[PDB]
């Protein structure tokens, strides 16, 4: 049963958001009266409460989206927000619709995009996974963060060949250790406003910790936003190696650590805009003759559904998640970055 008190910050919060006639969040445009009535008294078997799904937004009005998972049953309890929401986040996915099951598919088609190193500076490929039987950073109890510290770092630190690596907890890490990780760009600090009013930064930083390999091309966050965020990545354009070392390493922490999966949605994430397949993918690269033609640039990495940012040089990146396979997206992203080299050296 929902307590009074997490009523009465309910009620304050849905008023918020009514008064608030310039709040443009997601959050703000689903949660109608009708829907906030049917979800404030819900409970999850964890614990989780509407609250926990909605404080950010309400904290933070200029919130994109708004809403964040305290859990993985938060995804259905709280379906009736959470849908429209994914639904309207990424672009057609709709109540009904439904992710594929898991496919890296064949690593024999993923192929270096730019062997002679000529216009791709790097190459990421990344993940996210929630633990089996966990709640979410919102709801993780003191206990529950040095626990799955333990059990994440124990198994981390038994990988061998090119994922043998090294452990650091955030707990106790020294200035030395941390300008050391700065200068890898693998240091994860305490979390902006939006995480803060999610009561993900509880505890700092207690079942917070850094992994990576020795040759620094695979590296784990535990406990930065999701349970797990899985990088792999290098200098270069061999996505097929950084596609295949990221798939090894989940595949390997999986043996011990069950991952949370929905049939509907797929991999469950803190997040709604992580969901599906998690994976973002993408190059930084130097694409000068494009970059002359920029309206050009945006309409060919459109075309198979990239995004071009600054970081003629380029963060590009896919925007898919849901509704596809792990496999499709990261031919997605190679198809087009393909189509982009071949239009540079033809323009």
Same mark, same amino acid.
């Given at each position: 049963?929902?307590d009074?008190?997490?009523?009465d910050?309910?009620?304050?919060?849905?008023?918020?958001?009514?008064?608030?006639?310039?709040?443009?969040?997601?959050? +703000?445009?689903?949660?109608?009266?009708?829907?906030?009535d049917?979800? +404030?008294?819900?409970?999850?078997?964890?614990?989780?409460?509407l609250?926990?799904?909605?404080q950010?937004?309400?904290?933070?009005?200029?919130?994109?989206v708004?809403v964040?998972?305290?859990?993985?049953?938060?995804?259905?309890?709280?379906?009736?927000?959470?849908d429209?929401?994914?639904?309207?986040?990424?672009g *057609?996915?709709?109540?009904?619709d439904?992710?594929?099951?898991?496919?890296?598919?064949?690593?024999?088609t993923?192929?270096?995009?730019?062997?002679?190193?000529?216009y791709?500076?790097?190459?990421?490929?990344?993940?996210?996974?929630?633990?089996?039987?966990?709640?979410?950073n919102?709801?993780?109890?003191?206990?529950?963060?040095?626990?799955?510290?333990?059990?994440?770092?124990?198994?981390? +630190? *038994?990988?061998?060949?090119?994922?043998?690596?090294?452990?650091?907890?955030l707990?106790?890490?020294?200035?030395?250790t941390?300008q050391?990780?700065?200068?890898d760009?693998?240091?994860?600090?305490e979390?902006?406003?939006?995480l803060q009013?999610?009561?993900?930064?509880?505890?700092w930083?207690?079942?917070?910790?850094?992994?990576?390999?020795?040759?620094?091309?695979?590296?784990?966050?535990?406990n930065?936003?999701?349970?797990?965020?899985?990088?792999?990545?290098?200098?270069?354009?061999?996505?097929?190696?950084?596609y295949?070392?990221?798939?090894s390493?989940?595949?390997?922490?999986?043996?011990?650590?069950?991952?949370?999966?929905?049939?509907?949605?797929?991999?469950?994430?803190?997040?709604?805009?992580?969901?599906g397949?998690?994976?973002?993918?993408?190059?930084?690269?130097?694409?000068?003759?494009?970059a002359?033609?920029?309206?050009?640039?945006?309409?060919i990495?459109?075309?198979?559904?990239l995004?071009?940012?600054?970081?003629?040089?380029?963060?590009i990146?896919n925007?898919?998640?849901? *509704?596809?396979?792990?496999?499709?997206?990261?031919?997605?992203?190679?198809?087009?970055?393909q189509e982009?080299?071949?239009?540079?050296?033809?323009?």
């Amino acid at each position: 049963s929902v307590d009074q008190a997490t009523l009465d910050k309910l009620e304050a919060g849905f008023k918020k958001l009514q008064d608030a006639k310039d709040c443009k969040s997601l959050l +703000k445009k689903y949660l109608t009266k009708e829907i906030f009535d049917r979800l +404030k008294t819900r409970k999850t078997a964890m614990g989780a409460t509407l609250l926990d799904v909605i404080q950010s937004g309400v904290e933070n009005l200029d919130s994109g989206v708004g809403v964040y998972a305290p859990d993985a049953e938060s995804y259905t309890v709280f379906a009736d927000l959470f849908d429209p929401v994914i639904e309207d986040y990424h672009g *057609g996915f709709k109540p009904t619709d439904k992710h594929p099951p898991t496919d890296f598919g064949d690593m024999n088609t993923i192929v270096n995009v730019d062997p002679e190193n000529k216009y791709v500076v790097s190459t990421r490929v990344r993940c996210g996974r929630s633990l089996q039987g966990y709640p979410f950073n919102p709801c993780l109890t003191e206990a529950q963060y040095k626990e799955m510290e333990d059990k994440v770092s124990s198994q981390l +630190k *038994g990988m061998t060949g090119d994922l043998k690596g090294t452990y650091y907890p955030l707990t106790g890490m020294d200035k030395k250790t941390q300008q050391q990780l700065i200068d890898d760009h693998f240091l994860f600090k305490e979390g902006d406003r939006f995480l803060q009013a999610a009561n993900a930064c509880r505890y700092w930083p207690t079942g917070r910790g850094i992994y990576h390999n020795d040759a620094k091309t695979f590296l784990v966050w535990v406990n930065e936003e999701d349970h797990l965020r899985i990088i792999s990545m290098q200098q270069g354009g061999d996505l097929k190696q950084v596609y295949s070392r990221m798939v090894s390493g989940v595949k390997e922490i999986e043996k011990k650590l069950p991952f949370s999966r929905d049939d509907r949605l797929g991999f469950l994430t803190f997040c709604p805009t992580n969901l599906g397949t998690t994976i973002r993918a993408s190059v930084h690269i130097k694409l000068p003759k494009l970059a002359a033609d920029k309206a050009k640039l945006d309409s060919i990495a459109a075309k198979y559904n990239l995004q071009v940012r600054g970081t003629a040089v380029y963060d590009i990146s896919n925007k898919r998640r849901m *509704g596809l396979t792990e496999y499709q997206a990261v031919r997605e992203m190679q198809d087009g970055i393909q189509e982009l080299i071949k239009l540079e050296q033809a323009a």
